[PDB]
Amino acid sequence: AMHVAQPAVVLASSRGIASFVCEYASPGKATEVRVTVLRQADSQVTEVCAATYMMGNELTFDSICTGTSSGNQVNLTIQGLRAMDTGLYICKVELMYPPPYYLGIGNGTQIYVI
Amino acid sequence: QVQLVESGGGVVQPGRSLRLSCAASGFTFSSYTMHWVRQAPGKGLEWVTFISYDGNNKYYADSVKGRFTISRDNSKNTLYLQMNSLRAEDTAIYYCARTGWLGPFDYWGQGTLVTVSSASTKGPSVFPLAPSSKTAALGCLVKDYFPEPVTVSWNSGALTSGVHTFPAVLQSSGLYSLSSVVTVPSSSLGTQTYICNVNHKPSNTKVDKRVEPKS
Amino acid sequence: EIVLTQSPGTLSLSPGERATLSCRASQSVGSSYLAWYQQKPGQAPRLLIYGAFSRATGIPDRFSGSGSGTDFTLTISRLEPEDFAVYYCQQYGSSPWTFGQGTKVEIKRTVAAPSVFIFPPSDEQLKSGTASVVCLLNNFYPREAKVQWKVDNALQSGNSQESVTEQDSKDSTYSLSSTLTLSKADYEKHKVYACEVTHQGLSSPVTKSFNRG
Secondary structure, three states, X not given: OOEEEOOOEEEXXXXXXXXXXXXXXXXXXXXXXXXXXXXXXXXXXXXXXXXXXXXXXXXXXXXXXXXXXXXXXXXXXXXXXXXXXXXXXXXXXXXXXXXXXXEEEOOOEEEEOO | OOEEEEEXXXXXXXXXXXXEEEEEEOOOHHHOOEEEEEEOOOOXXXXXXXXXXXXXXXXXXXXXXXXXXEEEEOOOOEEEEEEOOOXXXXXXXXXXXXXXXXXXXXXEOOOOEEEXXXXXXXXXXEEEEOOOOOOEEEEEEEEEEEOOOOEEEEOOOOOOOOOEEOOOEXXXXXXXXXXXXXXXXXXXXXXXXXXXXXXXXOOOEEEEEEEOOOO | OOOEEEEOOEEEEOOOOOEEEEEEEOOOOOOOOEEEEEEOOOOOOEEXXXXXXXXXXXXXXXXXXXXXXXXXXXXXXXXXXXXXXXXXXXXXXXXOOEEOOOEEEEEOOOOEOOEEEEEOOOHHHHHHOEEEEEEEEEEEEOOOOEXXXXXXXXXXXXXXXXXXXXXXXXXXXXXXXXXXXXXXXHHOOOOEEEEEEEOOOOOOOEEEEEEOO
16 A cells, blocks of 8 residues: 655744655555645645656756655755745655556645744 | 547547547646546446656556557647557547546546447438337337437427437447337327438438338 | 445435445555546546545535545435436556446336337338337336247347336436347248236236237
């Protein structure tokens, strides 16, 4: 079974930087994987970030985001935040190759900006 | 405004190929991943194929693998399905569908029927199902046409009440048959005239047969 | 390949009644990456529930999803006339994407006997060279009916085909046609053509017959 695990709460930096590790468990040992940071609010959902990367090799970046890949976790750093950006941020890992395709959606991270 | 319009279905002889198209509207198509799903006549939903956001990753159902290709022209906002060595069992309505943000197939195309037969395009023969001598029932047997679909009315669409036009069935001949049937006053069996109007767009054919009581 | 089995095939419920649809998987399903779809015949599927329990934009309150692991239920709290449809559960957490075979939900009404009519082949058709004997079951409920063909009291097999209507909009009944295909040569070997039908609404089975000429 596919499980994605992100922290419950992160407070944001005085400058506007929130950082959180996003760990996943593949039943396979997949190589091409695609991470998406999502924002939830009511039934709606909005794209914040999206990255595709291959294995151990570096993360490729939506400009608002940066990160690192250190094994089977991804250190997603969001910046350029306003007080208005406080909400629920979902980690979405997709394992793309080799087969089978697996989809993983997290429980969400509450980011606070004050 | 979210819309998925597919086109270019129709008929193919077995072995020969056919490419389906689906054109997307009012979402930034680049951002959402896509699928095809078929539905064999009177059967369930079968996932056929998946395409990545870019197209750098493609997945195919076991039963089409080797024969079908999925592709996307992003700047044209269009999704395609190349189908290659078509079998009679590939006959289905083909749905294009969009994967939601969080995984389900949230938006679907309209449907496009692909018929895979060697059968020659043929208009119907229309035989009367004459009302019993010994409420009366009458009808038309719409026999040996190709391909689906056919339309039946009664008295130029002016008799709707009690009409039952059955689903077509596929015969051994590879041709289709159905009966339209209606039920009426036995009193008015002698007076009013009962004509069934059969329309077959794929061979451009209109046939009207008068249905008339027996000896 | 995560197989999905839904039960039953057919829910027979009156409008107003609660409907409970089951979906059971061959193995456990992710973190509830399981959808439900609705299909009113001649239309595309429409998404109803995702993430096992979350409702799709514009789907009304009466639709309701439960379950975890290998067991999932869709609840319709009251059946409105637009809800009588075919429903498919789907898993979407891993490839291949798979559906269940679907549960159809029909209107339940009181039992109705079919009215049976036998139609000999038309004169038109005989001259062409084949003979079609059409049998008609008109407006019956429920859908289970059996039709047997007898030519000179000998039972036919694999030379007849059936077709059934969708449940009548106005009265919730079905109609069925059995058509028997012989060749002109064949049709002229025998005298008595009989269509016998078994249905709930009939106290005993009914036969409809004619002799050629």
